[PDB]
Symmetry: D2
Subunit: 398 residues, 4 copies
């Protein structure tokens, strides 16, 4: 099994799988254990010294987690991956390992709300300078770069607007002018099936596994993906010391299980979303549809440059404010009123009347997060059913 | 009911249990879910705006985790608790939530290794200043206090030799010297069954639930306990943003399950360890035994004031060095060669040839570790079997 | 949610889902509990009397299991379903509830090996008469029917030959002549996505959920599906008393999770199998391919009569005996040498050198289970990878 | 090691543990897998042909389940054991594996309800003949023996009133009267910590592990224990074909976890129940208490011969009837209204208004159930709290 030459599905299914060498179990065993047994004091000493392979203690590493790490690194085309007990855990642990007091970060002004809060209010308590910029005007990006800029943090498509960012072109410019700077890309919305930021110049990829990679709405987990040199530091410092964000081995087993169908779900998510997006664009209550697959969309061709599929997140604005948005939220029958995304169940959320949250009213005016903006996570249901349900709720405001 | 007034076991078994109101199931359901459903758009807005309690999303809170949080707070006598995905996660999230660049921490110079690394190499990287002190020398502690000291961090009994710290004296001291200073006490080795730092004047208690609280060697998890106001910031800042240290609902279920027998397990751990410590002190291969229950122990009296039982951790020094520790390790048959503790299986490590193998013999003497020190977590087995196994191993190094 | 009018995927995803009315959890909670609490002695007495709804004790019923039961009944078009701790558990419990000492069974002579053993050696220890017949010659079927025939048991397509059986036409004839007789159909190989035997005249459907319905090779479970009147007896007698085959609530949660992608997996299983079957039919080491989707296949048009898709099990005979079969089993690199079926991983098994098992050498001569017969469970991998691996192993015997 | 020679707790904790040979993990891995991989086509043929041990497919056997099977066999002193997906599953699979149409069973007339239903209404439907007897009257037992009697089925102590059966006398009798007869003893209420029927001459022991063996109210499971030769047929016939009663590897993991504290839990269950039984007998609302540890108990001496401890089940009759039982049930605040037993939470049921509500007052008198009988499973709470809660409930019916 020189797995790396094979298809995506084969890699998702068989990649990183070591095998139960003692009983021959087909399925990955759940090594639900806190600690590990040494055969000798010498073997222990050598595991602690780095001389020998093998396991010590589940905060430091666990066989079930190792497999899903190796599987995702393989899918992203990265040397190494670390799995964490949440997406924010993988992001924080990566940021802690890469930065120190006095370093500087350039971030996108359009981010997942808790990433913005981590950057805006968290890292800045601890001596890290942060500048939020429009990643669509590279001159703005290039002028934010200071001699001590260590991370450029980007998310594409961006939660909640689906704004797309030229990964190759920011990476090139940053790498030309700041040789010490990492380019981080949050690839949650895409998964490696749709977008592989490491092939476009990114140095570090982060995911909320809570979303598409697990895919079943029963796991909180994250990953960081990148060079072995740096991921090793994320494991031995960001996770071991700074965050203690240890994925439960049972949760790792569930991510492995969900990744068995990652190819099939992303294909179905996206075919559903494209039908839904076209419906929304033609409905009389809708003013603007935000979707990478619509030719009307501002970042359509940047999406076509980086994304195999337009994805399965849709945002749209109703004619009418928050009030018409609330009316739709409160009368869908198949769509589920919840945050998160990437589940079998279609999810709908209305930042304007709920999570407008970690941003101030002004700070999301800058990012383009209007009231009346609805965000839709298109599920795996039959598309006619999703559309019928959206249609009945939208007809209420016509 | 008056659950606060009941016995300890009644509290461990029944405390924090909200109940399954839809189907009445006896066991706490595993709410293995990432997200939650809102009844209206406005309900979700109220919950995100702090105007209303209720669930939103498991990184911010989960019903299974809430239950074990409520149960441990009740046992510690604290107002609130947060469970994290590891001991270090609960420690780091608490420290992050109380500190900022420009703050100062006073810490014991005798701590769990990874706690020490986080303090010495981690927080100092981010503008926090840390002074390490010998907590036995109260005058040396009061001297290290600065006006920006925001955390005094203690661990008692501590690694690797079970040094005990006078919780009430130092906190009484710290509190009248600086009104804004949190006193942290790591209470892993004791659990609330043996020691309750908050009633001794501590502000925040941290736990590695990986050890005795879960007690079954199948969970990595942590807790912090204290005032509702601070724990809310540990949840909404330290967990939500800074660490992402989210316990799996499954792991919280297992911790709940493990806590049903905490009273019973702590009693047996301590009964066994008292017998093992007596035997080790009388054995000819053994130079010194560190056990709070032995009247030879330097902090015997102070431990007898703070701890309901002398615990079940044991450190002892062999007459000998690395080669001696290696032989004992490589010949125990019931005890298990493994780091960690608080397990039903008796665990044993020899740091000089194992955990502290990478360091030099001199650096290991800077960490309190002789070449003959052995650390012992006494399990739930029959004491005669534990002792017999230790006896034949140690007899191999008697001259 | 009048769910029954919606698409298959929507039903698989949302069907049977009650909802967490206390905390609003999206995912089904795991009610991992032995017993349930009464609010009053009166409420207890009424639950035991049948007067009140609600739960008593997990052998009698469990909320997590109730949901996957209701979900599968909805997909099959049956009134009720019971989930069991194995496929054999659902089959035995159904058979125990329907039969008594002195009743008679007509069964197909081509069956899953342990079903044959249950019928041939198990029920006959306990006074049940059993006659094994060729379900392809209805005159043979009709002549086996005795006045005391109570079950006609059939499996289509049959493990291991994939022989197809006219469900509508046996059901009609049996129902005309033996008004007291149940028609059981094992629908494991198809799932309700491909075949709905209750719509063709069957009275009872059984599944090994261990295979496609769970789909992830980490669960042993079964179902019976049928009229409420009879399923209620299976629950209160077959499961409660005769087998004690109680699905663990955690396993039920895993089946629910696997059914979220049942539509997507069956589509992918079958498109893969059709490509593999055509490859096998053209390879010089292969003498005969057994696959419903091949026009060469004996039961092609009976398959087209009953099956939306030709399925994803393939059997084939090599030119050469067991010896060439073993050579292929021992040199595949991506296919996994294991029994079971319906997993993400392609599985290959060689009854001739392994499980030829519960049949005698003669009894499978009658059913058509030759040596040199290989059975293939086509997985979810990329088809080129599955075919490349089969090709290299088969080339060894050319 | 000489695990057979060690103490009980050492056996419960370490017994049957094969070990994770690939990674050395301390906890038993959850082998949550349906199927297994063969190294060659011929290896799979050897395993299906009984020529070779090893795994095939989880309905035939799973490594997590094997471990808990080995552990329980060791505790009972039996050769082998099979775990099933419920108590009834292990009972039914054993009975199926030993009987056939034309066989005869002698059973106690005082059994667990669903066991009785299976015997009286289930097996008789399939040509098996069943005679129910009073096992206290040895002459009535020997009289019901027939040449085709293949099972003598016992349960001691039994529902609902804790009748004790002389295991060694009846089995000694049965064995010299009929050489091919299996003696079954249901050992649920005791566990191997208290009673071991195989050393008293029984052939097969059955368990509902749902009760004390798991002990945490989150598993439905069963066991049968006995000679390797019979248990192999229970596995390869009774489980594989006749019942399909396959334990989830996850459930087996939980039973293993629960058994780490079995010794500790049985001690506390019994200490608490002895205090609860004394209090109940002295209480004015209580007519009679059925407890093996009370010298008033009809089978006190026989129980003292067979049982290491008097157990933790308690039946008692109220001075009163259905209306009295209802009031007590509807006013306990710590005890839980629920069927089942062997849980860390104290459980209580009043059969006349609850489990046996569907039957008439006369049929319930045919089942040993007065209108004032209450069944009590004493938990792991503090005894004062259990008693206080029972006291205020019972005081509501004192004249
Ligand atoms: C939800 C989300 C996260 C947060 O990850 P968690 O698993 O919730 O900690 C991070 N990035 C993006 C783009 C998200 O949508
Ligand atoms: C093991 C330990 C910790 C760390 O907890 P983890 O759960 O391993 O992250 C902290 N303090 C003490 C005393 C410990 O023993
Ligand atoms: C594997 C199989 C079964 C047996 O079900 P289990 O889940 O293994 O008990 C029954 N029917 C068919 C067609 C099978 O392939
Ligand atoms: C509960 C019980 C059983 C039945 O076991 P289940 O696991 O519920 O199927 C059998 N015998 C006794 C004594 C019991 O208490
Ligand atoms: Cl989100
Ligand atoms: Cl540790
Ligand atoms: Cl199979
Ligand atoms: Cl019961
Ligand atoms: Na989902
Ligand atoms: Na699979």
């Amino acid at each position: 099994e020189n797995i790396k030459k094979m298809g995506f599905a084969t890699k998702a299914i068989h990649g990183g799988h070591i095998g139960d060498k003692q009983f021959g179990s087909l399925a990955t065993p759940i090594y639900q254990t806190s600690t590990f047994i040494f055969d000798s004091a010498e073997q222990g000493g050598r595991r602690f010294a780095g001389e020998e392979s093998g396991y010590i203690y589940s905060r430091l590493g666990n066989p079930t987690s190792t497999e899903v790490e190796n599987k995702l690194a393989l899918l992203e085309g990265g040397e190494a991956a670390v799995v964490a007990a949440s997406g924010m855990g993988a992001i924080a642990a990566s940021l802690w390992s890469a930065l120190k007091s006095g370093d500087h970060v350039v971030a996108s002004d359009t981010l997942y709300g808790c990433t913005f809060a981590l950057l805006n209010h968290g890292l800045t308590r601890y001596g890290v300078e942060v500048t939020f910029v429009d990643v669509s005007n590279l001159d703005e990006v290039k002028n934010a770069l200071k001699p001590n800029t260590k991370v450029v943090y980007l998310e594409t498509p961006a939660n909640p607007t689906l704004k797309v960012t030229d990964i190759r072109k920011i990476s090139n410019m940053v790498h030309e002018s700041n040789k010490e700077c990492f380019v981080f890309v949050d690839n949650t919305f895409c998964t490696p099936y749709i977008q592989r930021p490491l092939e476009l110049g990114a140095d570090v990829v982060v995911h909320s596994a809570t979303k598409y990679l697990n895919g079943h709405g029963d796991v909180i987990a994250g990953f960081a993906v990148g060079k072995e040199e740096f991921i090793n530091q994320v494991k031995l410092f960001g996770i071991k010391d700074m965050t203690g964000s240890v994925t439960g081995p049972f949760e790792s087993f569930l991510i492995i299980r969900g990744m068995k169908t990652l190819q099939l779900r992303m294909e179905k998510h996206c075919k559903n979303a494209m039908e839904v997006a076209k419906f929304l664009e033609s409905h009389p209550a809708v003013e603007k549809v935000y979707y990478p697959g619509l030719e009307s969309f501002k970042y359509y061709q940047l999406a076509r440059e980086q994304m195999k599929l337009p994805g399965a997140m849709i945002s749209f604005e109703l004619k009418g404010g928050v009030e018409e948005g609330k009316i739709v939220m409160n009368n869908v029958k198949l769509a589920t009123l919840a945050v998160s995304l990437g589940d079998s169940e279609t999810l709908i959320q209305h930042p304007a009347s709920m999570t407008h949250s970690p941003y101030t009213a002004e700070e999301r005016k800058a990012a383009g997060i209007s009231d009346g903006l609805v965000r839709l996570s298109v599920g795996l249901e039959d598309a006619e059913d999703i559309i019928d349900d959206l249609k009945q709720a939208l007809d209420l405001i016509v």
